[PDB]
Amino acid sequence: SRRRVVITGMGMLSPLGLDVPSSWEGILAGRSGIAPIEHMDLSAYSTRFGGSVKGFNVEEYLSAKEARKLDLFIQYGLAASFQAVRDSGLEVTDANRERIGVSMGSGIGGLTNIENNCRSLFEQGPRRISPFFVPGSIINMVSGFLSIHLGLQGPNYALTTAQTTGTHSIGMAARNIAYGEADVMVAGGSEMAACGLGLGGFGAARALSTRNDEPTRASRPWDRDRDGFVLSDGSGALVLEELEHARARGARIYAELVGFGMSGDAFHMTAPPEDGAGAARCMKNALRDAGLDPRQVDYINAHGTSTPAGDIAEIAAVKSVFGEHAHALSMSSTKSMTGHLLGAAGAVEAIFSVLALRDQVAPPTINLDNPDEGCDLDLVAHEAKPRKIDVALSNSFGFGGTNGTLVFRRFA
């Protein structure tokens, strides 16, 4: 029968920090992680900035010899996973290793490595493709390499659901534990799509902000002057654990994961429906899963991508789900500061939602100077808002009309 699931460990690389506390400090201070990209020449690109991980040292985690075989998205996913496992205090043993698994996903995976090997193939020939090209690039190898390093013999998989990946990964991992397929899961996502194909491909779709002369103001969810998402890099990982397992070992519990929803829009390959119907169906599924009155929801970490259609669809969905209570909760987009970590967005935002519960504060939506028509909820404009939060919801939406919602609450 269905078991309860708690969060005992969290790990992160973001444009605001090389771990959770440093990232969260930036979040509560309203700091932007967005800046012109230094790692490549983007003069021919319509977008030349994004949220880079600054000063990442893979030799805090892995030997340089191993690191050279792995795409940055794998290095970032392992860094966050190692932080989360360490933060949990969990000891992996012969007695429990079969009951500990991993589900770390990515939206695009090892695009930098595929681009670099494509350059080798086209300029030199196939004999110059790396022997490590496949295992160092494919999405499942965060889960794979983490399992090999820590000896995790539980369910081992990866999701890829575009901008919903981190949320789906965490929800499905919670279901694994709920249904008894595992007692512990490391789950989240990682992304590093800031290569020519990434910036060029999102640019060709005209999906990205082109505010090159003011990158920190580019990401402006629900602002009338928003012009698309800001592409960002990093990773979030959480240690999910069955409640009685966590209690038995005296784990520190950050919060309980009480609800998960999925729904497909079935609307459009890339565009959300303007009325937010799929996001509303997804939140309702999650609230019913959590056994909640919708009025219990205090804080929503929105998807909040800073796209014209996406941001207004989310307002419509929250009004439709929460009715008059939509005016009482606080909703913010931390993408205002981090940008959009794509497959990692739902993982870092789940962490921010848990910390909103720990610290009783709604992170701000920075840059919300002039809320757009109908964007008249409490969007926590400009500055963090201390408030009562018993229940927090984290939403993600993605290409293919794929929706996820996670519901977290305080654990006493």
Ligand X SMILES: CCc1csc(-c2cnc[nH]2)n1
Q: Which residues sit at the interface with ligand X, rule CB under 6 A? A: 19, 60-61, 66, 69, 82-83, 86-87, 145, 148-149, 269
- 135 touches a copy of itself (CB under 8 A): yes
Quickly tell me which residue has 């930036």 as its tokens. 26
Interacting partner of 87 out of a copy of itself, ligand X, none (Cβ under 5 to 8 A depending on kind): ligand X
List the interface residues with a copy of itself, window 64-83 (CB under 8 A): 69
Interacting partner of 140 out of a copy of itself, ligand X, none (Cβ under 5 to 8 A depending on kind): a copy of itself
Alpha carbons 193 and 210: distance in angstroms, whole number = 17
Alpha carbons 33 and 337: distance in angstroms, whole number = 6
**Nearer CB in complex with ligand X: 35/129:** 129
**Nearer CB in complex with a copy of itself: 152/351:** 152
* Distance between first and last Cα of the chain: 23
Binding mask 167-206 for a copy of itself (x = CB under 8 A): -x---x--x---x-x--------------xx-xxxxxxxx
Minimum Å distance from CB 82 to ligand X?
4
Eight-class DSSP state of 222:
T
Q: Report the residue from 23, 52, 112, 161 that binds a copy of itself according to the rule CB under 8 A.
A: 161
Taking CB under 8 A as the binding criterion, the range among 6-14, 221-229, 258-266, 365-373 that sits at the site for a copy of itself is: 258-266
Alpha carbons 77 and 312: distance in angstroms, whole number = 31
**H helices present in 10-91, as ranges:** 20-29, 64-67, 72-88
**Nearer CB in complex with a copy of itself: 14/103:** 103
Alpha carbons 169 and 353: distance in angstroms, whole number = 16
List the interface residues with a copy of itself, window 276-305 (CB under 8 A): 278, 281
- 228 touches a copy of itself (CB under 8 A): no
Minimum Å distance from CB 67 to ligand X?
9
Strand partners, 404: 262, 396
Q: Report the residue from 25, 60, 98, 213 that binds a copy of itself according to the rule CB under 8 A.
A: 98
Q: Residue length, the chain?
A: 412
Minimum Å distance from CB 111 to a copy of itself?
7
Residues 6+ away with beta carbon under 8 Å from 358: 254, 255
Alpha carbons 270 and 195: distance in angstroms, whole number = 21
Q: Contact 184/334 with Cβ under 8 angstroms?
A: no
332 token code pair: 């913010």
Interacting partner of 98 out of ligand X, a copy of itself, none (Cβ under 5 to 8 A depending on kind): a copy of itself
Minimum Å distance from CB 69 to ligand X?
5
3-state class (DSSP) for residue 103: strand
Judged by CB under 8 A, the number of residues near a copy of itself is: 87
Quickly tell me which residue has 């910390």 as its tokens. 355
Alpha carbons 132 and 129: distance in angstroms, whole number = 8
- 221 touches a copy of itself (CB under 8 A): no
Strand partners, 4: none
Interacting partner of 61 out of ligand X, a copy of itself, none (Cβ under 5 to 8 A depending on kind): ligand X
Q: Report the residue from 5, 258, 262, 368 that binds a copy of itself according to the rule CB under 8 A.
A: 262
Q: Contact 316/274 with Cβ under 8 angstroms?
A: yes
Interacting partner of 117 out of a copy of itself, ligand X, none (Cβ under 5 to 8 A depending on kind): a copy of itself
Q: Report the residue from 263, 307, 334, 338 that binds a copy of itself according to the rule CB under 8 A.
A: 263
Interacting partner of 167 out of a copy of itself, ligand X, none (Cβ under 5 to 8 A depending on kind): none
Taking CB under 8 A as the binding criterion, the range among 147-155, 293-301, 371-379, 382-390 that sits at the site for a copy of itself is: 147-155
Interacting partner of 83 out of a copy of itself, ligand X, none (Cβ under 5 to 8 A depending on kind): ligand X
Alpha carbons 77 and 144: distance in angstroms, whole number = 11
Strands 156-157 and 100-105: parallel
Question: For 82-100, b where at least 16 C-beta lie within 10 A, e where not — what string?
Answer: bbbbebbebeeeeebbebb
**Nearer CB in complex with a copy of itself: 125/250:** 125
